[PDB]
């Protein structure tokens, strides 16, 4: 049950300087990137083209190439239309794609953020502001919705191209997507004292980490955030707060799908 995401981030420093950079995710694996520096969209996987032919991908990339230049001018021109209401620096962010469900089902989304706040989306056959959005965006919205050609393209991108493409990706990237890498663990410590069970190298994201005395799961164990490694595996740590000289017979048990029922138990 996977979500495809096209994260775009655009900084407009002043009247004449901007950059637009994109990264693309399928679940928690990167499939593409597009640096401002580059004329073309980069694959970060062997299967990033999906099941699209070369001719289909070139036409798709060319649409984006025209979009990026066109997007840059439009923002610049929308700032002029609104000024002095809003001025630079400005940060535009888009989050777009589709979440895939079993059978043939999917929802597509295209959400826009202005200075870090979600304000606009494409919905149905038009742009609209979401709740909380400042009412001055109604002029930008009226202007964007005048562009009939863009509406029809975006509707085709959201309704048809996204789900079709992502069906292709999941077929093409099944083995990378369904990969199983094993966690490795280690222990450590730092008037109280805090024990730390480190777990690292595991894929996919789901994992269980408890501190234990025998069978007694120490309901007290604080779970950290999922931090990434550079090789598309995950890192997590669980801390437990204890009295000094009370570390005897404490263990860290971790369960994970790659271990095949054979849990890692480390004893202090």
């Amino acid at each position, epitope marked *: 049950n996977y979500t495809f995401r096209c994260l775009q981030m655009s900084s407009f420093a002043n009247r004449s300087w901007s950059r637009t950079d994109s990264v693309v995710w399928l679940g928690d694996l990167q499939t593409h990137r597009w640096s401002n520096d580059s004329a073309t969209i980069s694959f970060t996987k062997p299967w990033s083209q999906g099941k699209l032919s070369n001719q289909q991908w070139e036409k798709l990339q060319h649409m984006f190439q*025209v979009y990026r*230049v*066109s997007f840059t*001018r*439009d923002i610049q*021109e*929308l700032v*002029k*239309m609104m*000024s002095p209401k809003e001025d630079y620096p400005i940060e535009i962010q888009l989050s777009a794609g589709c979440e895939m469900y079993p059978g043939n089902a999917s929802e597509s989304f295209l959400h826009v953020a202005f200075q870090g706040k979600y304000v606009v989306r494409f919905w149905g056959t038009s742009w609209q502001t979401v709740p909380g959005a400042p009412s001055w965006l109604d002029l930008p919205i*009226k*202007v*964007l919705n*005048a*562009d*009939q*050609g*863009t509406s029809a393209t975006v509707q085709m991108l959201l309704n048809d191209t996204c789900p079709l493409f992502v069906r292709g990706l999941l077929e093409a990237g099944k083995s990378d997507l369904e990969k199983q890498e094993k966690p490795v663990a280690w222990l450590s410590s730092v008037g109280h004292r805090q024990l730390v069970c480190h777990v690292s190298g595991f894929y996919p994201k789901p994992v269980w980490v408890m501190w234990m005395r025998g069978d007694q799961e120490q309901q007290g164990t604080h779970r950290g955030d999922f931090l990434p490694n550079a090789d598309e595996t995950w890192y997590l740590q669980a801390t437990l707060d204890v009295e000094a000289g009370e570390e005897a017979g404490l263990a860290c048990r971790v369960k994970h799908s790659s271990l095949g029922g054979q849990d890692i138990i480390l004893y202090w």
Partner: T-cell receptor, first 111, second 113 residues
Framework: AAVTQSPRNKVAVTGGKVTLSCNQTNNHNNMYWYRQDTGHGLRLIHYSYGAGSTEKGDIPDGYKASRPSQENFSLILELATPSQTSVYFC??????????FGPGTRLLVLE | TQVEQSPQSLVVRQGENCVLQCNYSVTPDNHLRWFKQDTGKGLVSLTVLVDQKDKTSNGRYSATLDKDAKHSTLHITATLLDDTATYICVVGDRGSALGRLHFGAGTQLIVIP
């Protein structure tokens, strides 16, 4: 959707102040000033998105623009020159792409 | 010069047809418009083409647009004397007011009566 331009025809001397004006009763936010010289297409000088706004076009040098109101977008040549001999066209529009053009103003700047 | 017209000028006898090219490199190309301009007067719109492959008509004026070739023609059937005018090609690069219009330098028609 009608657009008017005054004057329609002007003879002026180098160093003079010339003011081409363009009135528009359609309540269009947006207005545009072009000039047409033989062997070129129309080229954008200045434009406006509303009362108070003025924006530089492709060939703004020599001209100041002025949008005092929704109705009037005025093109001001502060120190006229013979190079500014042209036929000047004004235009207006709302959010759509159509620009509704005025009838044209002929300017000759003599020495 | 992102919009080029051919011929630069042409002379035809009354009743004859003629064809006017416009080629462009403007990106993107939302729509293409053909203007008629009488000597002294200003800009009268004849037609506006919007589709990828498009065809329009307006009495004796007909026109095509192919956006892959980035090319448009204007056909005048059965020329009258009043057609003596400069004909101007214009490409708008957006479907909204955010667009710039890119103007051709014209094709000068003369119809001999």
């Amino acid at each position: 959707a009608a657009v008017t331009q005054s004057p329609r025809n002007k003879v002026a001397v180098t160093g003079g102040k010339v003011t081409l004006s363009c009135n528009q009763t359609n309540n269009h936010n947006n207005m545009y000033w072009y000039r047409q010289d033989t062997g070129h297409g129309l080229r954008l000088i200045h434009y406006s998105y509303g009362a108070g706004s003025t924006e530089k076009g492709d060939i703004p040098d020599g001209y100041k623009a002025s949008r005092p109101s929704q109705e009037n977008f005025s093109l001001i040549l502060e120190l006229a020159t013979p190079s500014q001999t042209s036929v000047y066209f004004c235009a207006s529009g709302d959010e759509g792409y159509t620009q509704y053009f005025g009838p044209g103003t002929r300017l000759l700047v003599l020495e | 010069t992102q919009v080029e017209q051919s011929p630069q000028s042409l002379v035809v006898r009354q009743g004859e047809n003629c064809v006017l090219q416009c080629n462009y490199s403007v990106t993107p190309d939302n729509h293409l418009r053909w203007f008629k301009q009488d000597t002294g007067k200003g800009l009268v719109s004849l037609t506006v083409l919007v589709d990828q492959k498009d065809k329009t008509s307006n009495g004796r004026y007909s026109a095509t647009l192919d956006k892959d070739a980035k090319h448009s023609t204007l056909h005048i059937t059965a020329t009258l004397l009043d057609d003596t005018a400069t004909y101007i090609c214009v490409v708008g690069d957006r479907g909204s007011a955010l667009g710039r219009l890119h103007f051709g330098a014209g094709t000068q028609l003369i119809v001999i009566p």
